[PDB]
Structure formats: structure tokens, C-alpha cells
Amino acid sequence: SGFRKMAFPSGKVEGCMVQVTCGTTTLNGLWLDDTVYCPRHVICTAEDMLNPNYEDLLIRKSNHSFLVQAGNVQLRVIGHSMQNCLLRLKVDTSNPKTPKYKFVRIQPGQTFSVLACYNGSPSGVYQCAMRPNHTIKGSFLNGSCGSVGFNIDYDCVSFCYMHHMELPTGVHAGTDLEGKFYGPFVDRQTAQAAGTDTTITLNVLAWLYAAVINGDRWFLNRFTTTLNDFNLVAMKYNYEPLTQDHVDILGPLSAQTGIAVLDMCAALKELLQNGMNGRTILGSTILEDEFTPFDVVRQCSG
Amino acid sequence: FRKMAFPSGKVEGCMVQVTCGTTTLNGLWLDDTVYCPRHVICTAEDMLNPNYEDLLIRKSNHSFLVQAGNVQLRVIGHSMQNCLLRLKVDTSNPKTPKYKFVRIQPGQTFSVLACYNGSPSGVYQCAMRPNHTIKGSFLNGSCGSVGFNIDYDCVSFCYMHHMELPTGVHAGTDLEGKFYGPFVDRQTAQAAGTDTTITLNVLAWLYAAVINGDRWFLNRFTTTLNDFNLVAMKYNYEPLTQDHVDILGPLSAQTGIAVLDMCAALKELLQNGMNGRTILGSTILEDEFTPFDVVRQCSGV
């Protein structure tokens, strides 16, 4: 009894952070085995950001151009290459602290923990969700470029995200561990806007279900609605429209609680048009949209 | 602005599984001692107002199964300190960090490493509520999960979880075994004072909003403490004491906004709502961010 957004223990990830400097620029690197991962824009010097040719800047540099520091001890860089927007430095020492890990690409709506790092040193950890416009909120303001996002499964650590830039709207944009961006974002300092900031409807429903499992129930109603009508309404309030696959994903949660998806939808529709009016659901005065149908199980369903 | 918890590595390396009889809960391993809730010695036949004293005597070091990973630690001594059990094990935790035991106060924040069976499962940032409780999300057997802060390289342990009150909120003790609030470790009626908003923290959050360029809500008029306090009580906000005004000084100093000015801004916001506008993104005010949190975080160095 008591729900709360939680991040994964950062322990195993903190032992993988390092510091990478090139010229006058310093940011976070990810040390796994004999490799350190970090944004390629580290080889860009402040003014070259307007429109860089990473291919050209990179060739004009040697292993000796890079300074990595495992905390205070320095690692020798004996190789460098570029995989998309990521820089891959081959080091002489294989990180003794390397955990079991995988590289995966997540989708908007999915959640993961972020270990906000400051110049190579761990500063804070938070749980967030990839927004529908492919960005990540959590205005973790600082020199955190290179901070990694991740999920911890059993013993395995799955890295899903790496931080690259702050968009001209706040919110952040990053890449997966293969160097491919999330969203229609480029590694430059050109004008760029992210899509519309919308609520993750799938997650909000997940949350209402969890609340139901948690004895909370005041918002429920005997009405049922169609997917279209519910979608027509949701959009007026800035909630993402619910696609068919989304309703499938709400399957299990719908098994327990014995509440049909379209039932819960009618409940949310009512909440949208009327409001909570001071009352709270599961503790907040606002709806939580960063909890996934899965999280709901990983913590409840059982 | 997103509230972060402290990285949990240093505390993870201090978590062990403690099992007595049929119960299994978490424990804190510092040097050669394991700290955990005394109610692990309870027996199913005695957890409805247990006689811990008796239950303690009827126990030897062998009743305890202390686990750290795949390795077992033989307990070689056991004593009680208030609501806590202190077990001396044969191994001195090689990972012990520099630490301190501190008694925190309502309104102050900390990170909680939610554990299950001696296993780090989740980590979060919360504030000790004004009625001496915390709104933790708790899974099965997370008792023993601790609260802490990280100041420099020193870990400040300030809380250990014991109970889940009838209200659903949580109650624990400091690392000396003494509860926070008028609660005891046993299934009893006991209720907590209603939950009120931490005014000091909201004011702290508005200062931080101002530091980050968000200031549309800054009114022009002023108010007294009495007047501000009356409006606050109206909206279920804890009253503001001189004590709290002094704590805001550093923030008042960096921004140039006198405390009574910010109380004037909050006062208007409460009496009028945010009109859909946002502050640091949220459409609602945050109260689990303290004055010191704003100094530490809003100062990268």
C-alpha cells in the first residue's frame, strides 16, 4: 500500500562512468570493457557546432588528443573511431567493474533510469519516460552530456540512452548506444524544435489500473466508451491517441481488476472533462504518466 | 527541474538479507555490525504486540541467517537498541563508506533505497512529511531499506523502515532505533497527524524557479507572516515559523527577493491557482525539495 515512481539502483552504472576531455571540452564517457562511449561532439570546439563535419574534425586527431579519467586514475587511449553520433575510444585497461550489459533501443512511452553525471562524476539518479516527441524531460541542468539512461533486468544492465543536447525548448535529446538519435534531431546547433509535448495516455491508464489494484476506486464509473470517442476526447486535452496495439498492451492489467480497457477509458474521459477537483489518486493531485503497463506489474500484479 | 535521488552505489554495498525464524527483512552492514528492525525476531505467534524482550532472550546467534550475496555471514553477538537489532558478524564490510548516523526532522529530504530480501530494488527521493511519516511505495519485505544523504563522500544514514501505517504511509526510526513521530512497532490503532504541505519547501522551490529564469508569478505587493500564515492554513500548508524564515535567507540573498515577498507570491498563487501556467514545468507546486537542496544542486560546484 503506497505507490511511488522509482529509479533503478545506480550502483552498477556509477562504476562505468568516466571523464572525457578533448581540447577545452569535458564530458561524460561510458566505460564498458576496454571501450569508452561518449558524444562525438566532444571533438567540437564551441564554435564548430554551428555546422560540423565530424569526419573532418575526427581525422585531424590522434588517440593522444583524448584524455579519459576513471575518477582520478587516467586510462590510456590506444584507438578511436566513430559509430554514428557516438565516439568509440579503445582503451588499454578493461573496466574491472564491467557489469553484464546489453544495448537496446527503446520507444516513446517507455521508461528508464538516468544517472545524471557531472563531468564524469555521478550527481543524481531519476526515473523518467521517453516522451511521445522523442525527448526526455527532467531538466537535469549541468555539464551532463554523456549521462546514460538504462534499465536493470535481473543481473543484466540494459543501456538505452545517452545524453547529447538541450533543445531550444528545454527538454533533452539523446542517442542509443549505437549512436542513433531518438527523434528527428541532428548533432548540430541549428534551429530545432521537438514535437508537441503530449501526455502518454497508455501510461496514465496503467496508473489508473494500478490505483484500482491499490484499493483506490473513486474515479471509476459504470459507463463504457468507444475507442474513437475516447480518442476524440483525449486529444482535446493533449493526451496521445490510443492505438489498437496500445489497448492490447493493456490486456493483462485488464485481466486482473476485471475491468475492460474501454471501461477504464470512460473513467479517464470523465476525469478529463470534470477533473479531480482537489481529490487525489494514489496520492498525487495529478495523473502519473511515466509508469508503464509493465512497471505496474514489476511492482504490483503479484 | 526534476528531483533526483543520490546515486545509490555506496549504500547498495551495505545491504544484506537478515532472516530470523520465518521472517526475512533488510539490514544495514557497516563495519562488523548489521542494523535491522528488531521485529525480525518476532514469531508468527507474537507480532500482535510482541514481547520483544522475551523473544530476544529466547534467541542465540544461530537463529540468525545473515546474507550478503552468495556469502553467508555468521552472526556472533546480538543486542537491542530501542527498535533496532544490532548484530555483530564475523566479517567487517570491506565496502563500508565514511558515514554518520543523524536524526533528521519533518520537512527534510533523503533518498530511500527500497530493498527486498537484502536486494536493492529501487531508489527514490522523498521528504519526511510534517506528521513524521513518508510516502514510500513499498513492495514485499522492504523493511530495513534505509534513508540517507550523500554530503561529499560521507553517507548520512537517517532512516530505516519498520511499519506501514493504516493510512498507507510509512513510519520508521533513525539509526539509533528511535521512531520518527508518535508511533510504535506493533499492529495498533495509532494514527498520524493529517498530511499538510511543506510550506518551507514550496518557498524553496519558487526560489529555485526564480534562479532558473521562471518568475512570472512574482507579485508586487507584500504581506506579513501572520497574514501569509493565515492564508496558508486555509490551503492546508503548514504555518511558517521564524525558524523557517531564517533558513530561506541564503536563497533570499542570492536572488534579492526578501522572504516576505516570496510569501506574497505564494499567497497570491494559492488564492488564484496557476491559471494553467507552469512553474519549472509543473502545473502544481513541489514540496519535497528543501532550501539546502536548492543550494547544493543549483551550485554545480
Q: Which domain holds residue A148?
A: 3-14+100-197
Supply the Cα-derived Rg of chain B in whole angstroms.
22
Closest listed residue to residue A29, CA positions, set A47, A12, A42, A11: A42
Q: Please choose, from the candidates B30, B33, B25, B29, the residue with its C-alpha nearest in 3D space to the C-alpha of residue B41.
A: B25
Q: What is the 3-state secondary structure (H, E, C) of chain B?
A: CCCCECCCHHHHCCEEEEEECCEEEEEEEECCEEEEEHHHCCECCECCCCCHHHHHHCCCHHHEEEEECCEEECEEEEEEECCEEEEEECCCCCCCCEEEECCCCCCCEEEEEEEECCEEEEEEEEECCCCCCECCCCCCCCECEEEEEEECCEEEEEEEEEEECCCCCEEEECCCCCECCCCCCCCCCCCCCCCCECHHHHHHHHHHHHHCCCCCCCCCCCCCHHHHHHHHHHCCECCCCHHHHHHHHHHHHHHCCCHHHHHHHHHHHHHHCCCCCCECCECCCCCCCCHHHHHHHCCCC
Cβ contacts of A143 on chain B, cutoff 8 Å? 300
Give the Cβ contact number of residue B120 at 10 Å: 24
Q: B214 CB near a chain A CB, below 8 Å?
A: no
Taking CB atoms and an 8 Å limit, are A141 and B280 in contact across chains?
no
- Gap between the Cα atoms of A169 and B262, Å rounded: 26
Handedness of CA A236, A237, A242, A247 (dihedral sign): negative
Resolution value in angstroms: 2.4
Q: In 3D, which of A295, A271, A283, A293 has the Cα closest to residue A2? A: A283
Same domain, residue pair B7 and B119 = yes
**One domain, residues A209 and A179:** no
Does B195 touch chain A if contact means CB atoms closer than 8 Å? no
Q: How far is CA B235 from CA A64, A286, B129, B167, B202, in A?
A: 61, 17, 16, 21, 13
CA distance A226 to A221: 15
Same domain, A188 and A231: no
User: Please, which residues 168-187 of chain B have a Cβ atom closer than 8 Å to chain A?
Assistant: 168-170
Same domain for B20 and B90? Answer: yes
Q: Using alpha carbons only, how large is chain A's radius of gyration in Å?
A: 22
Helix (H, G, I), strand (E, B) or coil at A167: strand
* Residue A78, SS3 per DSSP: strand
Helices (H), A73-158: none
Alpha-carbon A242 to chain mean position: 21
Q: Are B293 and B204 in the same domain?
A: yes
Measured distance CA(B58)–CA(B217) in Å, rounded:
63
Judged by DSSP in three states, A265 sits in helix
Most A CBs within 10 A among B4, B146, B287, hence the mutation to make, goes to: B4
Pick B137's closest partner by Cβ from A2, A140, A142: A2
Asked if B114's CB is within 8 angstroms of A2's CB, the reply is no
Among partner residues B8, B281, B300, which is closest to A11 by beta-carbon distance?
B8
The cell numbers describing B136, all together, are: 514510500
> What is the CATH classification number for the domain harbouring B92?
2.40.10.10
- Are both B170 and B265 inside the same structural domain? no
Q: Measured between alpha carbons, how far is A61 from A40 in angstroms, rounded to an integer?
A: 12
- Length in residues, chain A: 302
CB contact under 8 A, A139 and B280: yes
Which of B81, B97, B113 is the endpoint of a domain?
B97
Q: Say if residue B129 is in the same domain as residue B146.
A: yes
**Cα–Cα distance between B161 and B140 in angstroms, integer?**
12
Angle between the N-to-C axes of helices B242-255 and B259-272, in degrees from 0 to 180, rounded to the nearest 10: 100
Task: Name the domain boundary from B62, B97, B132.
Answer: B97
Contact (CB, 8 A) for A240 and A230: no
Name the nearest CA neighbour of B117 among B174, B69, B55, B56.
B69
Query: How is residue A56 annotated by DSSP?
Result: H
| Helix (H/G/I), strand (E/B), else coil: A231 | helix
Task: Give, for A220, the enclosing helix (H) or strand (E).
Answer: none
Residue B278 makes CB contacts below 8 A (sequence gap 6+) with none
Phi, psi of B276 (to 5 degrees): 75, -25
Q: What angle, rounded to 10 degrees, do the helices at A201-213 and A261-274 form? A: 100
Q: Do residues B119 and B5 share a domain?
A: yes
Do A61 and A177 fall into the same domain?
Answer: no
C-alpha cell at B34: 548489521
Q: Does A298 touch chain B (CB under 8 A)?
A: no
Give me the amino acid identity at A86: L
CB-defined contacts A:B, below 8 A: 98
A150: which strand partners? A113, A159
Report helix, strand or coil for A79. strand
CATH of the domain at A229: 1.10.1840.10
Total Cβ atoms within 10 A of residue B52: 17
Whether residue B113 is found in the same domain as residue B189: yes
Question: Do the beta carbons of residue B105 and residue B247 sit within 8 Å?
Answer: no
CB B209 within 8 A of CB B203: no
CA–CA distances in Å: residue B52 to residues A184, B39, B49, B57: 62, 7, 9, 9
Please say if A163 is a catalytic residue.
Answer: no
**Do B292 and B200 fall into the same domain?**
yes
Question: Which run of H or E residues covers position A47?
Answer: none
Which of B14, B20, B39, B115 is the catalytic position? Answer: B39
d(CA A38, CA B272): 46
Tell me the torsion sign for CA atoms B223, B224, B228, B231.
Answer: negative
Backbone phi, psi, residue B157, to 5°: -85, 120
Buried b (16+ CB within 10 A) or exposed e, A23-35: eebbbbbbbbebb
Name the domain count of chain A. 3
Can you tell me which residue has the cell 496500445? A246
d(Cα B256, Cα B250) in Å, to the nearest integer? 10
